[PDB]
Antibody
Framework: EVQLVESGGGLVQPGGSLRLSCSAS????????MHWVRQAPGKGLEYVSA????????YYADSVKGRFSISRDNSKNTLFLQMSSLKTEDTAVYYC??????????????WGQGTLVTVSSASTKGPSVFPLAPGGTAALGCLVKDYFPEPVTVSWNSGALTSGVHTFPAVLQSSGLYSLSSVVTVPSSSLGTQTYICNVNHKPSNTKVDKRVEP | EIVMTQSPATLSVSPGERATLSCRASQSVSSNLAWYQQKPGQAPRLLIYGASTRATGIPARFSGSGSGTEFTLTISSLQSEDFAVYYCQQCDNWPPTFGQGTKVEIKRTVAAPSVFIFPPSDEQLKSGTASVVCLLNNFYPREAKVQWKVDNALQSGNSQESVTEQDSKDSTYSLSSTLTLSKADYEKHKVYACEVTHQGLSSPVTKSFNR
């Protein structure tokens, strides 16, 4: 089976540079044009760049032309995207994508899993975790505030509590930091007797918090 | 540059019924059109190429049709996995362009949200900011309006919200809205209220607390 695996994504400042890699397997890499496509969080798909099978022809969307560079190593079956002259608007998941034999007027198949590039002036840091404090049903939760960059994971009771949990997409605040809420509905009669803990892990900052939420 | 326009923006379909998605190109691209499926948090995958050829491994219930400027993706009996976002892409012009996507969601009966309001914690107040959170839990359809009032003053520009993906079990949505105030501002006022408008509610519901 054909597999495409991107690496190299992460946080970078405007005025920095970043190199993405895509490792290809399961096909004769040098016989095929390759491409990059990106997707800003919550937005649609935007074509980025093309490279012919032997690397002799390259094409760039006007949005990245003069700033990004595409290249390929056919001996190592790798495709690259060099990102320079960066803008915050370059924040996106970047997808490696397999083309056909000639590079023009291709469709894209298959796609890599994607790698998230965050272009921002903000610096890495872990969240503060605040309680959303609570014979019927009650709601409680955790406010995972002021972290950067994405992503964060949230579980409840070390994974023992899954029913009724909603963990919301983060919002990007005007500060440049992210904020997310995770909630769960539980029996009102349990609020003072059952222990409810939200397990927050922010890998980019190596920050983990276990927060009990009580009335 | 060929402009691709998909319609509708969101298609609500009962499980087992047919879904028909439209894609229009601003010029003729013959049969040079592809369709992609993207499930939340996943990469897109190819469904259709050459307007009507199904990619390997794609179920038979997906079929593409059309030529020239008008194309159709037909999903003949929506299975649970099939609810996703669908993009078209012309494979004819040398700036490749995509449609903006059609979201296919499960249609179910109207369900009113349960609404909860959360004051800021004393811990957060110690650092000088107050977040007030309003939760709209397990409602359908997705359209809902949250209005924040602080001592009856409608808050505009002070809040952000987001919405979960459609729930796999009950096909509902949930929404969280955060109102941000400084500590000094939070302590100037007493009544904090979120008012929720939704098709499932005969009149707007308000949840509030006094600081």
């Amino acid at each position: 089976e054909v597999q495409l695996v991107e690496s190299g994504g992460g946080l970078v400042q405007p005025g920095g540079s970043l190199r993405l890699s895509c490792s290809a397997s399961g096909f004769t890499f040098s016989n095929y044009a390759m491409h990059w496509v990106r997707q800003a969080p919550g937005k649609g798909l935007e074509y980025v760049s093309a490279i012919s099978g032997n690397g002799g022809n390259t094409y760039y969307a006007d949005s990245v032309k003069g700033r990004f560079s595409i290249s390929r190593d056919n001996s190592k079956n790798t495709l690259f995207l060099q990102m320079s002259s960066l803008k915050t608007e370059d924040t996106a998941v970047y997808y490696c994508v397999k083309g056909q034999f000639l590079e023009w007027y291709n469709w894209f198949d298959p796609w890599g899993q994607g790698t998230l590039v965050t272009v921002s002036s903000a610096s890495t840091k872990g969240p503060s975790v605040f309680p959303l404090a609570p014979g019927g049903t009650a709601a409680l939760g955790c406010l995972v505030k002021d972290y950067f960059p994405e992503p964060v994971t949230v579980s409840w009771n070390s994974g023992a509590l899954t029913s009724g949990v909603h963990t919301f997409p983060a919002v990007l605040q005007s500060s440049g930091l992210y904020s997310l809420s995770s909630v769960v509905t539980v029996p009102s009669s349990s609020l003072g007797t059952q222990t409810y803990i939200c397990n927050v892990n922010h890998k980019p900052s190596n920050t983990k918090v276990d927060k009990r939420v009580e009335p | 540059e060929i402009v691709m326009t998909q319609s509708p923006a969101t298609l609500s379909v009962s499980p087992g019924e047919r879904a028909t998605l439209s894609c229009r190109a601003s010029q003729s691209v013959s049969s040079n059109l592809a369709w992609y499926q993207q499930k939340p948090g996943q990469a897109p995958r190819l469904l259709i190429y050459g307007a009507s050829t199904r990619a390997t491994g794609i179920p038979a219930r997906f079929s593409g049709s059309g030529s020239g400027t008008e194309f159709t993706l037909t999903i003949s009996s929506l299975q649970s996995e099939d609810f996703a976002v669908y993009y078209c892409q012309q494979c004819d012009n040398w700036p490749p362009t995509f449609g903006q996507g059609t979201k296919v969601e499960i249609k179910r009966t109207v369900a009113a949200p349960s609404v909860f309001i959360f004051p800021p914690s004393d811990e957060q107040l110690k650092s000088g900011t107050a977040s007030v959170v309003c939760l709209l839990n397990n409602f359908y359809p997705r359209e809902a309006k949250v209005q924040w009032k602080v001592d009856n003053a409608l808050q505009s520009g002070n809040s952000q919200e987001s919405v979960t993906e459609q729930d796999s079990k009950d096909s509902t949505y949930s929404l969280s809205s955060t109102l941000t105030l400084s500590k000094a501002d939070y302590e100037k006022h007493k009544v904090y209220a979120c008012e929720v408008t939704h098709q499932g509610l005969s009149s707007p519901v308000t949840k509030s607390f006094n600081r």
